[PDB]
Symmetry: C2
Subunit: 194 residues, 2 copies
Protein backbone atom coordinates (compact mmCIF):
# COMPACT_ATOMS: atom_id res chain seq x y z
CA UNK A 1 0.00 0.00 0.00
CA UNK A 2 2.60 2.56 -1.10
CA UNK A 3 -0.57 3.84 -2.73
CA UNK A 4 -1.86 5.24 0.55
CA UNK A 5 1.27 7.27 1.14
CA UNK A 6 0.57 8.63 -2.35
CA UNK A 7 -3.16 9.14 -1.76
CA UNK A 8 -2.40 11.09 1.43
CA UNK A 9 0.22 13.25 -0.28
CA UNK A 10 -2.39 14.20 -2.85
CA UNK A 11 -5.17 14.66 -0.27
CA UNK A 12 -2.76 16.89 1.66
CA UNK A 13 -1.73 18.92 -1.39
CA UNK A 14 -5.32 19.22 -2.65
CA UNK A 15 -6.31 20.52 0.78
CA UNK A 16 -3.57 23.18 0.74
CA UNK A 17 -3.57 24.37 -2.89
CA UNK A 18 -6.97 23.21 -4.12
CA UNK A 19 -7.33 20.56 -6.84
CA UNK A 20 -6.87 22.65 -9.98
CA UNK A 21 -3.66 24.28 -8.75
CA UNK A 22 -1.89 21.07 -7.66
CA UNK A 23 0.29 19.10 -10.07
CA UNK A 24 1.35 15.45 -10.05
CA UNK A 25 4.86 16.78 -9.53
CA UNK A 26 4.16 18.45 -6.19
CA UNK A 27 2.19 15.35 -5.22
CA UNK A 28 5.16 13.14 -6.09
CA UNK A 29 7.40 15.52 -4.13
CA UNK A 30 5.13 15.69 -1.11
CA UNK A 31 5.07 11.88 -1.18
CA UNK A 32 8.84 11.61 -1.49
CA UNK A 33 8.63 9.38 -4.56
CA UNK A 34 9.45 9.82 -8.23
CA UNK A 35 7.10 10.82 -11.05
CA UNK A 36 7.39 7.39 -12.67
CA UNK A 37 6.79 5.69 -9.35
CA UNK A 38 3.64 7.76 -8.94
CA UNK A 39 2.48 7.31 -12.53
CA UNK A 40 2.75 3.57 -12.08
CA UNK A 41 0.06 3.68 -9.36
CA UNK A 42 -1.93 6.69 -10.55
CA UNK A 43 -2.03 7.88 -14.13
CA UNK A 44 -3.76 11.11 -13.13
CA UNK A 45 -4.56 13.67 -10.53
CA UNK A 46 -8.12 12.52 -11.21
CA UNK A 47 -7.36 8.90 -10.32
CA UNK A 48 -5.90 10.00 -6.98
CA UNK A 49 -9.04 11.98 -6.23
CA UNK A 50 -11.07 9.01 -7.46
CA UNK A 51 -9.16 6.77 -5.05
CA UNK A 52 -9.81 9.17 -2.15
CA UNK A 53 -13.54 9.29 -2.95
CA UNK A 54 -13.54 5.47 -2.90
CA UNK A 55 -11.60 5.32 0.36
CA UNK A 56 -14.21 7.63 1.90
CA UNK A 57 -17.07 5.33 0.83
CA UNK A 58 -15.26 2.21 2.00
CA UNK A 59 -14.99 3.73 5.48
CA UNK A 60 -18.69 4.58 5.56
CA UNK A 61 -19.71 1.01 4.63
CA UNK A 62 -17.22 -0.73 6.88
CA UNK A 63 -18.94 1.18 9.68
CA UNK A 64 -22.53 0.50 8.64
CA UNK A 65 -21.51 -3.17 8.41
CA UNK A 66 -33.93 -2.29 14.53
CA UNK A 67 -34.95 -1.60 10.95
CA UNK A 68 -32.85 -0.33 8.04
CA UNK A 69 -34.51 3.06 8.49
CA UNK A 70 -33.08 3.32 12.01
CA UNK A 71 -29.61 2.36 10.81
CA UNK A 72 -29.81 5.09 8.17
CA UNK A 73 -30.17 7.49 11.10
CA UNK A 74 -26.97 6.36 12.80
CA UNK A 75 -25.08 6.26 9.52
CA UNK A 76 -26.00 9.94 9.03
CA UNK A 77 -25.07 10.97 12.57
CA UNK A 78 -21.88 8.90 12.29
CA UNK A 79 -21.02 10.79 9.08
CA UNK A 80 -21.13 14.27 10.64
CA UNK A 81 -19.34 12.93 13.69
CA UNK A 82 -16.25 11.75 11.80
CA UNK A 83 -16.58 14.67 9.42
CA UNK A 84 -15.28 16.40 12.52
CA UNK A 85 -13.15 13.77 14.27
CA UNK A 86 -11.53 12.11 11.26
CA UNK A 87 -8.84 14.03 9.38
CA UNK A 88 -9.13 12.30 6.01
CA UNK A 89 -12.91 12.81 6.05
CA UNK A 90 -12.60 16.45 7.15
CA UNK A 91 -10.06 17.33 4.42
CA UNK A 92 -11.71 15.37 1.60
CA UNK A 93 -15.14 17.01 1.97
CA UNK A 94 -13.58 20.44 2.55
CA UNK A 95 -11.71 19.96 -0.75
CA UNK A 96 -14.85 18.75 -2.49
CA UNK A 97 -17.04 21.68 -1.39
CA UNK A 98 -14.55 24.52 -1.02
CA UNK A 99 -11.49 23.67 -3.16
CA UNK A 100 -12.70 22.13 -6.42
CA UNK A 101 -13.93 24.76 -8.85
CA UNK A 102 -16.09 23.86 -11.79
CA UNK A 103 -13.83 25.24 -14.50
CA UNK A 104 -13.05 23.57 -17.84
CA UNK A 105 -9.55 23.18 -16.41
CA UNK A 106 -11.04 20.76 -13.86
CA UNK A 107 -13.64 18.99 -16.04
CA UNK A 108 -12.01 15.58 -15.53
CA UNK A 109 -12.07 15.84 -11.74
CA UNK A 110 -15.64 17.12 -11.88
CA UNK A 111 -16.68 14.15 -14.04
CA UNK A 112 -15.24 11.84 -11.40
CA UNK A 113 -17.05 13.62 -8.57
CA UNK A 114 -20.12 13.35 -10.79
CA UNK A 115 -20.08 9.54 -10.92
CA UNK A 116 -19.73 9.35 -7.16
CA UNK A 117 -22.76 11.64 -6.73
CA UNK A 118 -24.63 9.11 -8.88
CA UNK A 119 -23.37 6.37 -6.60
CA UNK A 120 -24.80 8.07 -3.52
CA UNK A 121 -28.07 8.87 -5.20
CA UNK A 122 -28.46 5.19 -6.01
CA UNK A 123 -27.60 4.27 -2.40
CA UNK A 124 -30.10 6.73 -0.95
CA UNK A 125 -32.70 5.37 -3.35
CA UNK A 126 -32.07 1.87 -2.00
CA UNK A 127 -32.51 3.07 1.59
CA UNK A 128 -35.78 4.77 0.66
CA UNK A 129 -37.12 1.78 -1.29
CA UNK A 130 -36.30 -0.49 1.65
CA UNK A 131 -37.87 1.88 4.18
CA UNK A 132 -41.08 1.77 2.12
CA UNK A 133 -41.05 -2.04 1.93
CA UNK A 134 -40.59 -2.33 5.70
CA UNK A 135 -43.32 0.30 5.94
CA UNK A 136 -41.10 2.89 7.68
CA UNK A 137 -42.09 5.30 4.90
CA UNK A 138 -45.45 5.75 3.18
CA UNK A 139 -46.12 3.86 -0.04
CA UNK A 140 -46.79 7.01 -2.02
CA UNK A 141 -43.48 8.59 -1.04
CA UNK A 142 -42.10 10.52 -3.99
CA UNK A 143 -38.69 8.81 -4.15
CA UNK A 144 -37.28 11.08 -6.89
CA UNK A 145 -37.96 14.19 -4.82
CA UNK A 146 -36.98 12.47 -1.58
CA UNK A 147 -33.46 11.79 -2.85
CA UNK A 148 -33.10 15.38 -4.03
CA UNK A 149 -34.46 16.57 -0.68
CA UNK A 150 -32.04 14.35 1.24
CA UNK A 151 -28.96 15.41 -0.72
CA UNK A 152 -30.04 19.04 -0.60
CA UNK A 153 -30.42 18.93 3.20
CA UNK A 154 -27.12 17.20 3.94
CA UNK A 155 -25.11 19.13 1.32
CA UNK A 156 -26.56 22.33 2.75
CA UNK A 157 -25.33 21.60 6.24
CA UNK A 158 -21.88 20.55 5.02
CA UNK A 159 -21.54 23.61 2.79
CA UNK A 160 -22.78 25.87 5.61
CA UNK A 161 -20.32 24.41 8.12
CA UNK A 162 -17.20 24.53 5.93
CA UNK A 163 -18.10 27.84 4.27
CA UNK A 164 -18.63 29.67 7.57
CA UNK A 165 -15.27 28.48 8.85
CA UNK A 166 -16.95 25.96 11.15
CA UNK A 167 -18.54 28.84 13.08
CA UNK A 168 -21.13 26.54 14.65
CA UNK A 169 -21.28 23.33 16.71
CA UNK A 170 -21.70 20.48 14.23
CA UNK A 171 -22.03 17.91 17.03
CA UNK A 172 -25.26 19.50 18.20
CA UNK A 173 -26.58 20.93 14.91
CA UNK A 174 -26.43 17.87 12.68
CA UNK A 175 -28.64 15.65 14.94
CA UNK A 176 -31.35 18.29 14.94
CA UNK A 177 -31.23 18.74 11.17
CA UNK A 178 -31.16 14.97 10.68
CA UNK A 179 -34.19 14.47 12.93
CA UNK A 180 -36.21 17.12 11.15
CA UNK A 181 -35.24 15.70 7.73
CA UNK A 182 -36.24 12.18 8.71
CA UNK A 183 -39.48 13.44 10.27
CA UNK A 184 -40.29 15.28 7.04
CA UNK A 185 -39.54 12.13 5.06
CA UNK A 186 -41.97 10.21 7.24
CA UNK A 187 -44.80 12.73 7.62
CA UNK A 188 -44.64 15.76 5.32
CA UNK A 189 -47.25 15.73 2.47
CA UNK A 190 -44.85 17.70 0.21
CA UNK A 191 -42.72 14.58 -0.12
CA UNK A 192 -45.65 12.38 -1.11
CA UNK A 193 -45.89 11.20 -4.68
CA UNK A 194 -49.33 12.75 -4.75
CA UNK B 1 -20.40 57.02 -14.86
CA UNK B 2 -22.77 54.44 -13.38
CA UNK B 3 -23.10 52.91 -16.84
CA UNK B 4 -19.34 52.58 -17.23
CA UNK B 5 -18.90 51.01 -13.79
CA UNK B 6 -21.64 48.62 -14.90
CA UNK B 7 -19.74 47.69 -18.05
CA UNK B 8 -16.60 46.81 -16.09
CA UNK B 9 -18.61 44.95 -13.43
CA UNK B 10 -20.39 42.73 -15.95
CA UNK B 11 -17.06 42.17 -17.72
CA UNK B 12 -15.64 40.80 -14.47
CA UNK B 13 -18.72 38.66 -13.88
CA UNK B 14 -18.20 37.22 -17.35
CA UNK B 15 -14.60 36.16 -16.91
CA UNK B 16 -15.12 34.94 -13.32
CA UNK B 17 -17.86 32.74 -14.71
CA UNK B 18 -15.59 31.47 -17.47
CA UNK B 19 -12.58 30.43 -15.42
CA UNK B 20 -13.24 31.06 -11.74
CA UNK B 21 -12.18 33.91 -9.52
CA UNK B 22 -8.74 32.67 -8.48
CA UNK B 23 -7.45 32.38 -12.06
CA UNK B 24 -9.00 35.61 -13.37
CA UNK B 25 -6.58 38.53 -13.67
CA UNK B 26 -7.23 42.29 -13.77
CA UNK B 27 -5.74 42.37 -17.29
CA UNK B 28 -8.15 39.71 -18.52
CA UNK B 29 -11.08 41.62 -17.08
CA UNK B 30 -9.81 44.85 -18.64
CA UNK B 31 -9.37 43.12 -22.00
CA UNK B 32 -12.88 41.64 -21.77
CA UNK B 33 -14.24 45.10 -20.89
CA UNK B 34 -12.40 46.51 -23.90
CA UNK B 35 -11.00 49.20 -21.58
CA UNK B 36 -7.44 49.83 -20.47
CA UNK B 37 -5.84 48.66 -17.25
CA UNK B 38 -5.79 52.20 -15.86
CA UNK B 39 -9.42 52.85 -16.79
CA UNK B 40 -10.51 49.70 -14.96
CA UNK B 41 -8.34 50.64 -11.98
CA UNK B 42 -10.13 53.99 -11.90
CA UNK B 43 -13.34 52.30 -10.75
CA UNK B 44 -12.07 49.08 -9.18
CA UNK B 45 -8.58 48.59 -7.78
CA UNK B 46 -8.93 44.82 -7.29
CA UNK B 47 -11.03 41.76 -7.91
CA UNK B 48 -12.44 41.82 -4.38
CA UNK B 49 -13.84 45.25 -5.33
CA UNK B 50 -15.53 43.92 -8.46
CA UNK B 51 -16.86 40.94 -6.50
CA UNK B 52 -18.06 43.04 -3.56
CA UNK B 53 -19.84 45.33 -6.00
CA UNK B 54 -21.31 42.25 -7.64
CA UNK B 55 -22.61 41.21 -4.24
CA UNK B 56 -24.23 44.62 -3.79
CA UNK B 57 -25.92 44.51 -7.18
CA UNK B 58 -27.48 41.21 -6.08
CA UNK B 59 -28.44 42.46 -2.60
CA UNK B 60 -29.93 45.57 -4.24
CA UNK B 61 -32.10 43.54 -6.59
CA UNK B 62 -33.52 41.40 -3.79
CA UNK B 63 -34.20 44.49 -1.69
CA UNK B 64 -35.51 46.69 -4.50
CA UNK B 65 -38.09 43.95 -5.05
CA UNK B 66 -39.11 44.55 -1.45
CA UNK B 67 -47.12 40.40 6.78
CA UNK B 68 -43.37 40.29 7.29
CA UNK B 69 -43.54 36.46 7.35
CA UNK B 70 -45.52 36.37 4.08
CA UNK B 71 -43.12 38.79 2.35
CA UNK B 72 -40.23 36.62 3.51
CA UNK B 73 -41.88 33.61 1.88
CA UNK B 74 -42.29 35.59 -1.32
CA UNK B 75 -38.69 36.81 -1.17
CA UNK B 76 -37.42 33.22 -1.12
CA UNK B 77 -39.70 32.08 -3.97
CA UNK B 78 -38.63 35.10 -6.02
CA UNK B 79 -34.98 34.39 -5.28
CA UNK B 80 -35.05 30.92 -6.83
CA UNK B 81 -37.21 32.07 -9.71
CA UNK B 82 -34.63 34.62 -10.85
CA UNK B 83 -31.72 32.25 -10.24
CA UNK B 84 -33.31 30.68 -13.34
CA UNK B 85 -34.36 33.77 -15.29
CA UNK B 86 -31.82 36.47 -14.39
CA UNK B 87 -28.41 36.05 -16.01
CA UNK B 88 -26.60 38.21 -13.46
CA UNK B 89 -28.02 36.18 -10.56
CA UNK B 90 -27.51 32.81 -12.25
CA UNK B 91 -23.78 33.41 -12.82
CA UNK B 92 -22.99 35.27 -9.63
CA UNK B 93 -24.31 32.45 -7.45
CA UNK B 94 -22.82 29.85 -9.75
CA UNK B 95 -19.44 31.53 -9.28
CA UNK B 96 -19.97 31.89 -5.54
CA UNK B 97 -20.74 28.18 -5.08
CA UNK B 98 -18.67 26.53 -7.81
CA UNK B 99 -15.80 28.83 -8.88
CA UNK B 100 -14.51 30.54 -5.78
CA UNK B 101 -12.18 28.09 -4.05
CA UNK B 102 -11.36 28.86 -0.42
CA UNK B 103 -7.60 29.01 -0.80
CA UNK B 104 -4.98 31.42 0.57
CA UNK B 105 -4.87 32.92 -2.92
CA UNK B 106 -8.52 34.06 -2.63
CA UNK B 107 -8.42 35.14 1.00
CA UNK B 108 -9.40 38.71 0.04
CA UNK B 109 -12.40 37.62 -2.03
CA UNK B 110 -13.52 35.12 0.64
CA UNK B 111 -13.29 37.93 3.20
CA UNK B 112 -15.85 39.83 1.11
CA UNK B 113 -18.12 36.80 0.74
CA UNK B 114 -17.93 36.45 4.54
CA UNK B 115 -19.06 39.98 5.31
CA UNK B 116 -22.07 39.37 3.10
CA UNK B 117 -22.93 36.14 4.93
CA UNK B 118 -22.85 38.17 8.15
CA UNK B 119 -25.45 40.61 6.83
CA UNK B 120 -27.66 37.84 5.44
CA UNK B 121 -27.50 36.33 8.93
CA UNK B 122 -28.53 39.79 10.12
CA UNK B 123 -31.39 40.27 7.66
CA UNK B 124 -32.76 36.84 8.57
CA UNK B 125 -32.42 37.27 12.33
CA UNK B 126 -34.56 40.39 12.06
CA UNK B 127 -37.15 38.57 9.95
CA UNK B 128 -37.24 35.91 12.64
CA UNK B 129 -37.43 38.62 15.29
CA UNK B 130 -40.65 40.17 13.97
CA UNK B 131 -42.10 36.72 13.34
CA UNK B 132 -41.94 35.72 17.03
CA UNK B 133 -43.25 39.13 18.08
CA UNK B 134 -46.05 38.95 15.52
CA UNK B 135 -46.75 35.39 16.67
CA UNK B 136 -45.91 33.83 13.29
CA UNK B 137 -43.38 31.83 15.29
CA UNK B 138 -43.11 30.64 18.90
CA UNK B 139 -41.33 32.51 21.72
CA UNK B 140 -39.91 29.05 22.19
CA UNK B 141 -38.02 29.54 18.89
CA UNK B 142 -34.27 29.02 18.96
CA UNK B 143 -33.37 31.99 16.74
CA UNK B 144 -29.72 31.03 16.44
CA UNK B 145 -30.39 27.48 15.28
CA UNK B 146 -33.20 28.78 13.09
CA UNK B 147 -30.90 31.09 11.14
CA UNK B 148 -28.43 28.23 10.54
CA UNK B 149 -31.36 26.05 9.54
CA UNK B 150 -32.61 28.60 7.04
CA UNK B 151 -29.16 29.19 5.52
CA UNK B 152 -28.25 25.49 5.26
CA UNK B 153 -31.58 24.67 3.62
CA UNK B 154 -31.28 27.36 0.95
CA UNK B 155 -27.55 26.75 0.42
CA UNK B 156 -28.10 23.03 -0.09
CA UNK B 157 -30.76 23.56 -2.72
CA UNK B 158 -28.50 26.02 -4.57
CA UNK B 159 -25.35 23.91 -4.36
CA UNK B 160 -27.36 20.82 -5.26
CA UNK B 161 -28.82 22.53 -8.34
CA UNK B 162 -25.50 23.91 -9.58
CA UNK B 163 -23.46 20.80 -8.66
CA UNK B 164 -25.83 18.42 -10.44
CA UNK B 165 -25.47 20.56 -13.54
CA UNK B 166 -29.07 21.72 -13.10
CA UNK B 167 -30.34 18.14 -13.49
CA UNK B 168 -33.64 18.89 -11.71
CA UNK B 169 -36.54 21.34 -12.11
CA UNK B 170 -35.77 24.25 -9.78
CA UNK B 171 -39.18 25.83 -10.37
CA UNK B 172 -40.96 22.73 -9.06
CA UNK B 173 -38.41 21.83 -6.43
CA UNK B 174 -37.81 25.18 -4.67
CA UNK B 175 -41.46 25.86 -3.70
CA UNK B 176 -41.55 22.58 -1.79
CA UNK B 177 -38.14 22.80 -0.14
CA UNK B 178 -39.24 26.23 1.05
CA UNK B 179 -42.70 25.00 2.06
CA UNK B 180 -41.25 22.22 4.19
CA UNK B 181 -38.68 24.63 5.66
CA UNK B 182 -41.35 27.16 6.69
CA UNK B 183 -43.55 24.44 8.25
CA UNK B 184 -40.51 23.21 10.20
CA UNK B 185 -39.73 26.71 11.49
CA UNK B 186 -43.32 27.17 12.62
CA UNK B 187 -44.05 23.71 14.04
CA UNK B 188 -41.03 21.46 14.57
CA UNK B 189 -39.84 20.91 18.21
CA UNK B 190 -36.18 20.47 17.31
CA UNK B 191 -36.11 24.18 16.33
CA UNK B 192 -37.26 25.32 19.78
CA UNK B 193 -34.96 26.37 22.63
Amino acid sequence: KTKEHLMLAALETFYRKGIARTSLNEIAQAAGVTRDALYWHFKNKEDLFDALFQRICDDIENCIAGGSWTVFRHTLLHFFERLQSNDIHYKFHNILFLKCEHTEQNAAVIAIARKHQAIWREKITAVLTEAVENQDLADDLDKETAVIFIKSTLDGLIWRWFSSGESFDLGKTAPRIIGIMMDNLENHPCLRRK
